Design a protein around this ligand. Structure first.
Ligand SMILES: Cc1ccc(N(CC#N)c2cc(Nc3ccc(OC[C@H](O)CN(C)C)cc3)ncn2)c(Br)c1
Length: 285
């Protein structure tokens, strides 16, 4: 750590506090995360230093000293959450929303091709720069209910299979989360703001319809599925994300399919007609 000087507190991350810091030597400005060490952790983390992509926050170095773990990441000046809030009254322009979704799908396609899942995608761990790029952060660190600061972990972006107690979820969980983020960027309001696991599940059911064996084979046998779940009817996406166009609604619907196996893959989503006219606009930061 002596090689680093803490500039400011970036925020209380899920696995520890994060500080903007400078390499007392290289002058490099980075994001320093102190992880709240098992050999299994070290090996997995070392594997992440290899997962390099333009849309994945670069893990610069892993420091294992004094039996403590520090992760040094590339530094970006803001997360998507702050940007969405700052664009609340005007709304993020569609071309930029399209650009961000496109880039994130590229990042996911990359990770997923390497069999790596994010598992906890949310606006707070999506970082943007002044150039128009957006990157996935804290990728692979998943493999708690509260943070080290007791802060509640958001359930708003959790896939239904996870909520239903699935133990071996797939890359499909990341597509679901991104779909929820996509919808939020368009409407300027969280799609499923649950404040408990059951409230989260029921919010999803109230919008997409209570899942059954027809739309999701095997759902009634899932760990936490209850035959007593209320049966709500499905609503039109025309009502869910106006004024998103049909290409956009088509894509969002495929990203929010109940059956993880039916849910569109990142790579297939990249070929969706919605991205026919994709561009890379510069954000107003
Ligand atoms: C909650 C949290 C804490 C740390 C990070 N990590 C780690 C990784 N991987 C960063 C951040 C960063 N830059 C930056 C990120 C946020 C930020 O402000 C966050 C505020 O908390 C905004 N909120 C209102 C959402 C300022 C600079 N550059 C590289 N890595 C992330 Br992702 C989320």
């Amino acid at each position: 750590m002596e090689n680093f000087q803490k500039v400011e507190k970036i925020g209380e991350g899920t696995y520890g506090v994060v500080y903007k810091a400078r390499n007392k030597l290289t002058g490099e400005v980075v994001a320093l995360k102190k992880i709240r060490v098992p050999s299994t952790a070290i090996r997995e983390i070392s594997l992440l230093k290899e997962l390099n992509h333009p849309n994945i926050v670069k893990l610069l170095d892993v420091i294992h000293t004094e039996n403590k773990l520090y992760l040094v990441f590339e530094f970006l000046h803001q997360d998507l959450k702050k940007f969405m809030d700052a664009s609340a009254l005007t709304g993020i322009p569609l071309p930029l929303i399209k650009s961000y979704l496109f880039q994130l799908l590229q990042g996911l396609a990359f990770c997923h091709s390497h069999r790596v899942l994010h598992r906890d995608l949310k606006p707070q761990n999506l970082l943007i720069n002044t150039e128009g790029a957006i990157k996935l952060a804290d990728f692979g660190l998943a493999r708690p209910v509260r943070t080290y600061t007791h802060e509640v972990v958001t359930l708003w972006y959790r896939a239904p299979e996870i909520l239903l107690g699935c133990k071996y979820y797939s890359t499909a969980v990341d597509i679901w989360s991104l779909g929820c983020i996509f919808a939020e960027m368009v409407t300027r309001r969280a799609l499923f703001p649950g404040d408990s696991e059951i409230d989260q599940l029921f919010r999803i059911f109230r919008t997409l319809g209570t899942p059954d064996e027809v739309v999701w084979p095997g759902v009634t046998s899932m760990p936490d599925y209850k035959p007593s779940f209320p049966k709500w009817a499905r609503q039109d996406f025309s009502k869910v994300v106006p004024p998103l166009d049909e290409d956009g609604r088509s894509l969002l619907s495929q990203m929010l399919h109940y059956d993880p196996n039916k849910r569109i893959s990142a790579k297939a989503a990249l070929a969706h007609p919605f991205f026919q006219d994709v561009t890379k606009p510069v954000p107003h930061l």
